[PDB]
Amino acid sequence: TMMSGRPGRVPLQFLPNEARSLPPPKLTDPRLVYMGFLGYCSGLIDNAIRRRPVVSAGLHRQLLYVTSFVFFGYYLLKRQDYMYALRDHDMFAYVKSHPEDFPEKDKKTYGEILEEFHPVR
């Protein structure tokens, strides 16, 4: 799946307009919480490197790190969900438009299938 050549794709569009039809990630999304945790860890390591009280040196700096991480994570998650939605839409459309390549398998019950039995001895 190389989607660079997809027809009707704006070159440098981070989030296309049709992505607005997808549900946005919730503000309490676990991945957003993880990005905020990453920002908090970045703040702690920043305090540790510059030889400052790790937990309580700069509250504004740690808050800025967490907020920026959450912002970028929200937009990145939006783009991720949009790209996966595009992949699924393309796969379903291709399956619909090529019936001969995806035949409907005849439903068969185990009572009429013969599976070889290997005893455990």
Binding site: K107, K108, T109, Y110, G111, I113, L114, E115, E116, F117, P119, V120, R121
Partner: protein, 175 residues
């Protein structure tokens, strides 16, 4: 006792002989068992009665769980996971029930062997044949499945056995 069903675990009438003192000497067994009764059985009995009236003052019941019958693995599609799950659970429950059945039969056999004592070889032939039959049945269903056993493996084993039986019957008829 009413706590357990007499038909499931049968017992003989337990005929016992009568005391026939051929001598006038007072045997120690009777006096010993009477003093044992007086010193042990009565206090235990009264304690039990007190506990029983304490239990009757508070009464509650619990009900044995009943299960519906679900289509087994033979009425399941090759990849339909929901029915295979239901059939596997049902098969495991039936396996547990069969294990308990074999346990009950083995209990019958052990009880007979102890109860009839010295003539256990003759007076327990019924229980021996019963256990032989149930053991033959149980072994056929689950003996070689091994670990990671499943309903599909049991069904495949049954199919292999029944094709073998059908071929043997056809060859015997056409012999």
């Amino acid at each position: 006792p009413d706590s357990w069903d007499k038909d499931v675990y049968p017992e003989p009438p337990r005929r016992t002989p009568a005391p026939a003192p051929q001598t006038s000497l007072p045997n120690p067994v009777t006096y010993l068992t009477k003093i044992f009764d007086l010193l042990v059985d009565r206090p235990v009995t009264l304690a039990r009665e007190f506990i029983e009236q304490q239990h009757a003052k508070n009464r509650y019941y619990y009900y044995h769980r009943e299960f519906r019958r679900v289509p087994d693995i033979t009425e399941c599609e090759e990849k339909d996971i929901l029915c295979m799950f239901e059939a596997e659970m049902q098969w495991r429950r039936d396996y547990k029930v069969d294990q308990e059945i074999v346990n009950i039969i083995q209990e019958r056999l052990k009880a007979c062997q102890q109860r009839e004592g010295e003539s256990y070889r003759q007076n327990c032939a019924k229980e021996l044949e019963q256990f032989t039959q149930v053991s033959k049945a149980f072994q056929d269903r689950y003996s070689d499945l091994g670990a990671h056993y499943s309903a599909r493996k049991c069904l495949a084993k049954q199919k292999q056995r029944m094709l073998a039986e059908r071929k043997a019957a056809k060859e015997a008829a056409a012999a």
